[PDB]
Amino acid sequence: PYTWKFLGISKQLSLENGIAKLNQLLNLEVDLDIQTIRVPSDPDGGTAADEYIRYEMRLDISNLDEGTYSKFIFLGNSKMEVPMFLCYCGTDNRNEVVLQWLKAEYGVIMWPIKFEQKTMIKLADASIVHVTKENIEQITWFSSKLYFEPETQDKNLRQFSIEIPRESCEGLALGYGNTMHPYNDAIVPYIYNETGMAVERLPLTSVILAGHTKIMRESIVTSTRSLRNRVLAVVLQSIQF
């Protein structure tokens, strides 16, 4: 149920410097958390430039629904050419008010974000993975469902799907061997071998992990109230050029 929308930020604003004028503008005081995280800790992902700084800001007069619960997330890094992006959820229009304040205050210019098919697959890979307290990676399997919607003459082929239960996903990943990004590593090559179909090239519309999340063209829908850090890191790395 928890949807999301992402915007890009053209300057590494220090949000804490300006919280008060937002508060009086919004007629309420918002929280502001600070986290310096090291999300891509795997060796091939890197051990430097991992120092993303995360901000949790919330407009919770209450938390009875997403609109009241609507919480913003800023995550940035100084080495990043465009330094920071933004996330928010819910239909509440106070989000628009705070965005207006940002753009008018810091002289910053902002735009919405899109995803590519490969971006979607990478994000889905990032959604399943979890880390234990011992700093050890682990994977939780969900019944994946690829869902495409091509354009063809006379609507010959309107839509088609490839559903992959948990057992088949786990079996393909194990057959490929010990790996960390099974959807890109094993599943898609298997689909191509069995059907000659290039999932990357085909017009993907959604990647649904049943009971966990729905990844879509313009938004992320999540079972949990929040997004785990690798999701946000993947988003930021996708913002760039």
Partner 1 sequence: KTTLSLLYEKSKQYGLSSPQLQALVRLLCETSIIDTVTKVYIVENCFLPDGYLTKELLLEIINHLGTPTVFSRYRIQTPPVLQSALCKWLVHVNISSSIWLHLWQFSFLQKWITPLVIWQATTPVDVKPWKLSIIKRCAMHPGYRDAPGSATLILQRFQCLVGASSQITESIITINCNRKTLKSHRNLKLDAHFLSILKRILSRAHPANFPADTVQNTIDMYLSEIHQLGADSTVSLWDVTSLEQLAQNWPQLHIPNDVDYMMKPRKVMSRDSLKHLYSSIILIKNSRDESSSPYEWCIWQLKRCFAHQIETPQEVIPIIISVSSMDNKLSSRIIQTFCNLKYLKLDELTLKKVCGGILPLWKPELISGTREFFVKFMASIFMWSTRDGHDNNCTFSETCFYVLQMITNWVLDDKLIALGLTLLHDMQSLLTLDKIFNNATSNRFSTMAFISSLDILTQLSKQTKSDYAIQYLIVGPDIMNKVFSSDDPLLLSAACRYLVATKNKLMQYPSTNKFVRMQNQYIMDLTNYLYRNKVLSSKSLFGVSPDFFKQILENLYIPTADFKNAKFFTITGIPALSYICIIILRRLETAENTKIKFTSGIINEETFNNFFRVHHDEIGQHGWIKGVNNIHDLRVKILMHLSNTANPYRDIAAFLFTYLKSLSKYS
Q: Which residues bind partner 1 (CB under 8 A)?
A: 10, 91-94, 96-97, 100, 103-105, 107, 109-111, 241
3-state secondary structure 144-199: EEEEECCCCHHHCCCCEEEEECHHHHHHHHHHHCCCCCHHHHHHHHHHHHHHCCCC
Shortest reach from residue 112's CB to partner 1, in Å: 9
Residue 116 or 163 having the CB closest to partner 1: 116
What is the DSSP code (8-state) at residue 225?
S
Shortest reach from residue 197's CB to partner 1, in Å: 26
Residue 19 or 97 having the CB closest to partner 1: 97
Shortest reach from residue 107's CB to partner 1, in Å: 4
Shortest reach from residue 208's CB to partner 1, in Å: 26
Q: Which backbone phi and psi does 91 adopt, to 5 degrees?
A: -95, 0
At 97, list the tokens: 């008010």
Shortest reach from residue 59's CB to partner 1, in Å: 12
Q: Of 13, 227, 214, which is closest to residue 115 (Cα–Cα)?
A: 214
Q: Of 203, 209, 200, which is closest to residue 165 (Cα–Cα)?
A: 209
Q: For the chain, percent helix, then strand, then coil, each to nearest 5?
A: 30, 25, 40
At 32, list the tokens: 């502001």
Residue 106 or 142 having the CB closest to partner 1: 106
Residue 67 or 171 having the CB closest to partner 1: 67
Residue 9 or 124 having the CB closest to partner 1: 9
Residue 94 or 181 having the CB closest to partner 1: 94
Shortest reach from residue 241's CB to partner 1, in Å: 3
Phi-psi category of 195—alpha, beta or left, where left has phi over 0 and alpha has psi -120 to 50?
Answer: alpha
Q: Are strands 204-209 and 144-148 parallel, antiparallel or unpaired?
A: antiparallel
